[PDB]
């Protein structure tokens, strides 16, 4: 029996910051700020990956698998996992984009972990990355909700019982029409109340299943890394699960909802701020357009500090965030 | 130890046919009058009936495409909604034409390492959306996988990507942001698929003589011939339907597999070699050990909405 330990983590938040005050200028949550990228999604992903690689101390030749969870890719042909691969010079790895909306990163984590357990993948890079700013209708509720950013992890095969344990991922397809941008693709819809109910239900039931199969009580959960879409969803999810609200890591106020990137960014910050201790039990939970949903139980291993650090950074930004949206 | 048997197969080729005419290996392609999700849906319905599984038994839906109707939400969730499958994991995977093989690999390992008992893996494309040209068509192919103890379905696979070839095959300004270098695409494809096939064969302990059938990506007849010649595999073992449908990217393999079974090209316990490549440049190969059954348990009446248009008409 093999496991996929999370041995590296990293993030990339673009520098141009957009305050609510900045928003008041042109405009008539929990969120105070978001970032707005002056580069493509593949660039955000690349830098976050560089941080996780250095954090893990792995050589780029050791990576067998790159998954980019996104719903805002630079291009469809080719995918952007292959762009990240080209940028980092990783040779020969499997490389794909996965689209499960905000639950993408959890889907990716589940997928890479099972690939590693059943076959010959020794290290993996799983990245959540978005440039939601590309989508926004500056007239329309939606505009204040979303930001740009990337988060990444590196997974390394091991015999120790760590990394993702059980996961339960799914999709409530009867809710598909309540959250959509239907004419971008080869072809907004936003019903807040229904999104709310189905999200808490989907994430809730998924979390419960994971906990029950792991034999854990809510009390043995040390940290909750939820999708950062809405503070009230997070509070409600915990309240209904009976999980103390202090265990939930929240950074939505800083970055807004960055779809697939929220969980890996939160996870990276939680580690940097020492919120996660060696051998802690984490509960991850997320949902997204689809309506996709998921939860996972991660057992952390020995190390919560980077082996090294990267000098990787985005090209210098000559623009303000107000400037980027003009 | 668990395995993912291919217990259902099915396809959906849109009716409007486009012959070679004035206005590869290829004589015809199909041109869809519906979205990609619709092609995927019908192919799925055929596979479900072929497998005799109930829609409530499906735990996982993967749609390999690079021409989805929408990015938000994904189209796996649309297929799920159309078939009424409750609660399954549903995602879109983009690895260009190697998508279906990537999906097959992913679903198989999900099923072996965790609690997914049945899966639907679909390749589906509407490449006609992209064209500015005689090389591509539209279509979908699907399989259903069912967990079992018998040593059948995908055995070893080797998937990868040659990222130094990323720029030789691209539509770079569709997305949130044509390039086509035929000779380089040719060289890297044969190299990528070749090396992948070799690694799979070697790990499986097979000689090329024990391969019964080859289901390759249908992008170009000469690529297929060259891949076999260099592997030492007899060219007669390679199933080819490109002449009928053209290159339907992620859909080529599952359509070919489905037709190979319908035409009795595949026998119980046959060893299949799948191989594919795509923009990325992605590449992959897989060894499938077929089980007992090569006939559908049932048939579906599922069909696309009636087409009132000619294919010439559809491109206008």
From Swiss-Prot, chain B:
Q: What is this protein called?
A: Beta-ketoacyl-[acyl-carrier-protein] synthase III 2
Q: What class of enzyme is it?
A: transferase
Where does the source fall among the domains of life? Bacteria
Top-level taxonomy: Bacteria, Pseudomonadati, Pseudomonadota, Gammaproteobacteria, Vibrionales
Q: Name one GO biological process term.
A: fatty acid biosynthetic process
A family per Pfam: ACP_syn_III
Task: Indicate where this protein resides in the cell.
Answer: Cytoplasm
- Which keywords, in A-to-Z order, does the entry hold? Acyltransferase, Cytoplasm, Fatty acid biosynthesis, Fatty acid metabolism, Lipid biosynthesis, Lipid metabolism, Multifunctional enzyme, Transferase
Species source reads Vibrio cholerae serotype O1 (strain ATCC 39315 / El Tor Inaba N16961)
Q: Which SUPFAM superfamilies match?
A: Thiolase-like (SSF53901)
Q: What does this protein do?
A: Catalyzes the condensation reaction of fatty acid synthesis by the addition to an acyl acceptor of two carbons from malonyl-ACP. Catalyzes the first condensation reaction which initiates fatty acid synthesis and may therefore play a role in governing the total rate of fatty acid production. Possesses both acetoacetyl-ACP synthase and acetyl transacylase activities. Its substrate specificity determines the biosynthesis of branched-chain and/or straight-chain of fatty acids.
């Amino acid at each position: 029996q093999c496991y996929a330990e999370i041995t590296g983590w990293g993030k990339c938040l673009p520098p141009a910051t957009l305050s609510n005050h900045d928003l008041s200028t042109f405009l008539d949550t929990g969120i105070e700020q978001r970032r707005i990228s002056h580069v493509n999604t593949s660039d955000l992903a690349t830098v976050a990956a560089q941080h996780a690689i250095a954090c893990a101390g792995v050589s780029v030749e050791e990576i067998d698998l790159i998954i980019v969870a996104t719903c805002s890719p630079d291009s469809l042909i080719p995918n952007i996992a292959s762009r990240v691969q080209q940028n980092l010079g990783i040779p020969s790895a499997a490389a794909f984009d996965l689209n499960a909306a905000a639950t993408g990163f959890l889907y990716g984590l589940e997928t890479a972990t099972r690939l590693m357990q059943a076959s010959h993948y020794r290290h993996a890079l799983v990245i959540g990355a978005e440039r939601l700013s590309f989508y926004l209708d500056w007239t329309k509720d939606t505009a204040v909700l979303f930001g740009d950013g990337a988060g990444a992890v590196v997974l390394s095969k091991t015999e120790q019982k760590v990394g993702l344990q059980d996961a339960q991922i799914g999709c409530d397809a009867q809710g598909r029409d309540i959250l959509a941008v239907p004419k971008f693709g080869t072809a907004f819809d936003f019903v807040g109340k229904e999104i709310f109910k189905r999200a808490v239900r989907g994430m809730g039931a998924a979390a419960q299943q994971v906990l029950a199969r792991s034999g854990l009580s809510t009390e043995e959960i040390d940290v909750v890394i939820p999708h950062q879409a809405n503070i009230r969803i997070i509070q409600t999810l915990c309240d209904l699960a009976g999980i103390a609200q202090d265990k939930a890591f929240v950074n939505i106020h800083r970055y807004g909802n960055t779809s697939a990137a929220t969980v890996p960014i939160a996870l990276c910050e939680a580690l940097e701020q020492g919120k996660i201790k060696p051998h802690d039990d984490l509960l991850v939970a997320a949902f997204g357009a689809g309506l996709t949903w998921g939860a996972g139980h991660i057992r952390w291993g020995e190390r919560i500090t980077p082996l090294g650090k990267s000098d990787a950074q985005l090209p210098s930004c000559d623009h303000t965030a107000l400037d980027l949206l003009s």
